[PDB]
Design a protein around this ligand. Structure first.
Ligand code: FAD
Ligand code: FAD
Ligand code: COA
Ligand code: COA
Ligand code: CL
Ligand code: CL
Lengths: 565, 565
């Protein structure tokens, strides 16, 4: 009978504990959790802060007692593993109640300790008004600062998904919010031009968005004067727990009542390092595809481990919940000798940004250039369902692919509806090894409330495939401000449309007058065409190339261009 | 110049006309439409009757004038092609204004003439109060009768998508509705236990839904007496355009003010039969995968043609717009010598039914049985997103598959949220050749507003794979009512739940007391287990089977069983 010990009681470990019971009734299964709760909804926490999830009870999905009744797993809360001795096959555990210590033997051990927020080397950042969000205790601390310090202004640093969620929650509470990101965009899984849709939605809500901007120093200032109604002062905007004065990277000062640090997480590797397990170059635990560490009796899964990138096969960190649960279930399988292999991580992700969703999978354009992987890109901006039926919303969709083999590299989407669905479709098409030309033949669900005769995905697949076959010749938003003397810029929109914006020096020939007004364009210049989203531009392009012009069409039209600057 | 002629100016024929001009500016392109409108939203029509789509103008996406300006295609509205002389490469055309006729030569011809509503042999069916819905004039006539016959009760016959949409639309107008269907279920692409969720929802809205029932006679009675205010009568509930008295097949009488006939459509084949083109056993035009009829110069697409079923490779009729649009494009590619091949049809379909969506792709259990293909199924009843974040809905999902090869045969889903997403993901996975076991590795988009850590599809992948591998043993809803003297019925829900319904004679041991209470179950019997959705049943099955019992779990739980009756 195997003695199985599991370190960490959430996404990786609890999922392995439950699976392992279903596999064998004779194994002993002990699960250690340093915190008070197991199987809590980490993803839930910014939504309880805003009150969107009303009930704190909805965040706890299992208990020590439920794990014992259902799965006969001995869960030990407030118990922290403080060392693994590999040779002896024993761990040392501390009872956080009283500081006492004991040892526990294992036959096999799973490490699922996760990742802790990153501590920055910012002077003065450790103080009573600065919090990172990882667990329920971190959440009650934030909530308790909001309450006690009468938070009217808050700053969040980092525009990854934890940050955006916390800016949103704060905003939902009526708190005036500043978000600082050092990068030129929020949400780095999508590229910068895609993130431009999210920037504009963030600023439309009145949020002070400060891209390209770092926190340099934090000054905490204790409140010495307690205003009172008794001394006939106004008490409504006092902050009795103190004040923060922030220095930013350009030396401007920001005054704030609360600071949320959300600049990423790093793998918990201290136990693993102490025990001599291999650590990878990104600083996560190194595991093979069976999820086993450098020691064959020790498995590891989740935010603590490095994963193989599905597209390139290189090491990556992707701290998400889906991979952690499925890994955990798989390590339980391996632990009973099933030899199952984890198939790599695509990085499929989605985040709510007020009314928008921002989603992606696979590799982005920054990642591909950095790895010297040659690619092409397409944009579409296609209604989320048939446009004549109410409630349809534009889906701005990016597809990244090999221009020769049609390999799918990456997809990104942003919009008010139907994003989760387009990212999932792409994630399955990529995992299944579909090329862009095969994507053409997708037969998706269409009725007018839900879809369209040609989906976002079919349209993208035609535009990308046209480029592959040489029936289209692209230029991109970053090329078109840079024209030569043998190129002539042509706006094929209607003239009414140019007052919303356009490109310096364009000649204007609406697409529906072009067949007839074409002799106006000289055949010894490469005609450089754009329309609103690309689509009219494509028709024009084809009319010109069919007549022996050299041409190019601006992919994603003026829309993509507009949001890319 | 290639001279191209196109019969039908909607989904097939218009899509070919537009692609054709993008391929060639030299080609002459003449597209005949016997009606007044090209490029109308056929799918929009029920939603306009309800007023859900307010403006009649939103149903028109192209006009003769737009098609000439944009695409230099000469559209001839009110011109019906009445004969094809294939040997001469001439068609004979009739101008409906005049009844006059002329010939027009072609180099290549495209038949996209659609499918006409089926005419049933029911006495008295042809009358001023009964209508089927194909086009805009049909729609206006339905509007006209509703207004002028002050329609207060209406009857729809046929429970496929047109009939369900017309039912919902009439309801939505305040009209009391009856829906007649001869089959034991609405919406035949899903199986009868999945339709059972839709049955309940239609009934909940107060629609008189009559399954297994046919319409045997219609009696139209003109109205002789016009009540009037001057005569001092109540004029509110009069019908001056008359009355319908229906005879049903069980002999009952139904009195109604409007009759909609929605009993399916039949391919427009007369032109092809008279011209001597091949027709299949289903009554559709027979094409190869390049969409070419038996005459290599003549192409045919859309509702008029038989297609190749994706899964079985046999002939089938699937009158849907996605395929028709993509066939039309491919036919135009083929008319310029590109030799592209259509890849078979899955039958991916979805229909709104009040708050539910009912969706499917692939083959259904009915089709599989008929064809003698060995299969297995699984159900799952999974929240549409993380159930702790509000607005999560149950997705009831059926997956069908080869129990030994893992081949995906089809998928079905019903519920109030996220049905289009799961049907699209399954259509992608089958079209890409994924097996059930490969489905377990799907990495789909999770944030609490949008998904769950393990999605509906991952949970289905797991449940099915467990059967394939021998880690689960199923019984299904239609077997559990039998049971021998060698079998003992075990309900693992809590006592409180048997309240809502249960299975007669079950022993009740709730799962979380099972491990301790187990000795109560005699090991010389196969224990037949069920819980609500089948999830606790699985935990219970594992416990018993790991203890050397014979066991089965009821797949889909009490829920799937309840809606099966
Ligand atoms: C606010 C927030 C929102 C998120 N939203 C999403 C989302 O929308 N979608 C998504 O995919 N992902 C989301 N995530 C990430 C997701 O929570 C993780 O990727 C996943 O939970 C990781 O599982 P894990 O088992 O690796 O680690 P964790 O869930 O962090 O669990 C590890 C546990 O190990 C315990 N532990 C550590 N060391 C020891 C020790 N030495 N002894 C005893 N116990 C120990 C820790 O206390 C912790 O409780 C979000 C995370 C946060 C913080
Ligand atoms: C009410 C309704 C709702 C629908 N909803 C959906 C849905 O939600 N999703 C979906 O996928 N599909 C839906 N459809 C089906 C979809 O409309 C068809 O599958 C698609 O339009 C078929 O395209 P087609 O070119 O084959 O035929 P059609 O669009 O019918 O076009 C054929 C045209 O050819 C003309 N014609 C015929 N013969 C001649 C001739 N001899 N000379 C000249 N003209 C001729 C006809 O008048 C007609 O306008 C719906 C259909 C209806 C009626
Ligand atoms: C819930 C948790 C304890 C794991 O418990 P679990 O029992 O394995 O998980 P589930 O409820 O999802 O059930 C999955 C099992 O039910 C089975 N199943 C699901 N639906 C079924 C059904 N309708 N009929 C039969 N079996 C079903 C699956 O096959 C699977 O069993 P298997 O792994 O043996 O194949 C763990 O995921 C957890 O603690 N999560 C919360 C923390 C977390 O994930 N946070 C991430 C950040 S939000
Ligand atoms: C509209 C209709 C006239 C066809 O016109 P179309 O020009 O082929 O259709 P679309 O607007 O979808 O455009 C598709 C073209 O735009 C291109 N495209 C789409 N988005 C693009 C973008 N943003 N940038 C560049 N090109 C783009 C596509 O590649 C495609 O060109 P291709 O086929 O040469 O590759 C025909 O579909 C129609 O009549 N539909 C209504 C009738 C119907 O389907 N009713 C059915 C039931 S509702
Ligand atoms: Cl455009
Ligand atoms: Cl259950």
């Amino acid at each position: 009978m195997k003695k199985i010990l599991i370190i960490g009681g959430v996404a990786g470990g609890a999922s392995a504990a439950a699976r392992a019971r279903r596999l064998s009734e004779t194994a002993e299964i002990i699960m250690f959790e340093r915190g008070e709760y197991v199987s809590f909804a980490n993803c839930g926490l910014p939504y309880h802060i805003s009150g969107e999830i009303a009930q704190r009870s909805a965040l706890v999905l299992q208990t020590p007692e439920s794990f014992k009744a259902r799965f006969n797993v001995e869960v030990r809360v407030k118990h922290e593993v403080v060392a693994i001795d590999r040779a002896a096959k024993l761990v040392t555990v501390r009872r956080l109640l009283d500081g006492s210590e004991y040892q526990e033997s294992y036959d096999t051990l799973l490490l699922s300790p996760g990742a802790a927020p990153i501590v920055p080397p910012i002077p003065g950042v450790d103080n009573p008004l600065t919090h990172s969000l990882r667990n329920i205790p971190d959440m009650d601390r934030i909530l308790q600062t909001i309450q006690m310090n009468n938070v009217e202004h808050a700053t969040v640093v980092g525009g990854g998904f934890i940050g955006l969620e916390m800016m949103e929650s704060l905003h939902h509470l009526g708190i005036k919010t500043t978000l600082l990101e050092l990068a030129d965009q929020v949400m780095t899984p999508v590229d910068r031009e895609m993130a431009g849709f999210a920037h504009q939605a963030i600023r439309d809500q009145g949020v002070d968005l400060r891209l390209g901007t770092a926190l340099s120093e934090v000054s905490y200032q204790v409140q010495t004067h307690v205003a009172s109604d008794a001394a006939g002062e106004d008490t409504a905007h006092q902050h009795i727990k103190g004040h923060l004065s922030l220095t930013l990277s350009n030396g401007e000062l920001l005054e704030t009542d609360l600071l949320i640090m959300a600049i990423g997480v790093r793998p918990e590797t201290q136990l693993a390092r102490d025990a001599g397990l291999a650590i990878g170059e990104l600083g996560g635990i190194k595991v093979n595809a069976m999820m086993q560490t450098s020691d064959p009796a020790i498995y590891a899964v989740g935010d603590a481990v490095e994963e193989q990138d599905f597209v390139t096969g290189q090491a990556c960190l992707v701290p998400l919940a889906g991979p952690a649960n499925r890994q955990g279930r798989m390590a339980a399988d391996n632990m009973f000798g099933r030899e199952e292999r984890y198939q790599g991580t695509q990085g499929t992700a989605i985040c709510k940004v007020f009314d928008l969703a921002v989603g992606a999978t696979g590799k982005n354009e920054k990642q591909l250039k950095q790895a010297g992987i040659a690619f092409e890109k397409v944009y579409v901006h296609t209604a989320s369902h048939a446009s004549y039926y109410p409630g349809a919303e534009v889906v701005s969709f990016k597809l990244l692919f090999d221009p020769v083999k049609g390999t799918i590299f990456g997809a990104q989407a942003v919009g008010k509806d139907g994003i989760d669905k387009r990212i999932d479709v792409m994630a399955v098409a990529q995992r299944a090894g579909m090329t862009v030309e095969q994507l053409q033949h997708l037969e998706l669900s269409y009725a007018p409330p839900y879809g369209s005769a040609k989906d976002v995905i079919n349209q993208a697949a035609f535009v990308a495939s046209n480029i592959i076959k040489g029936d289209a010749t692209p230029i991109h938003f970053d090329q078109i401000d840079n024209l030569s003397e043998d190129q002539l810029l042509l706006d094929v929109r209607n003239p009414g449309e140019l007052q919303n914006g356009g490109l310096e020096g364009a000649v204007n020939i609406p697409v529906d007058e072009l067949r007839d007004r074409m002799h106006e364009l000289p055949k010894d210049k490469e005609i450089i065409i754009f329309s609103q989203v690309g689509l009219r531009g494509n028709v024009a392009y084809r009319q010109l190339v069919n007549n022996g012009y050299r041409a190019r069409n601006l992919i994603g039209g003026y829309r993509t261009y507009k949001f890319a600057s």
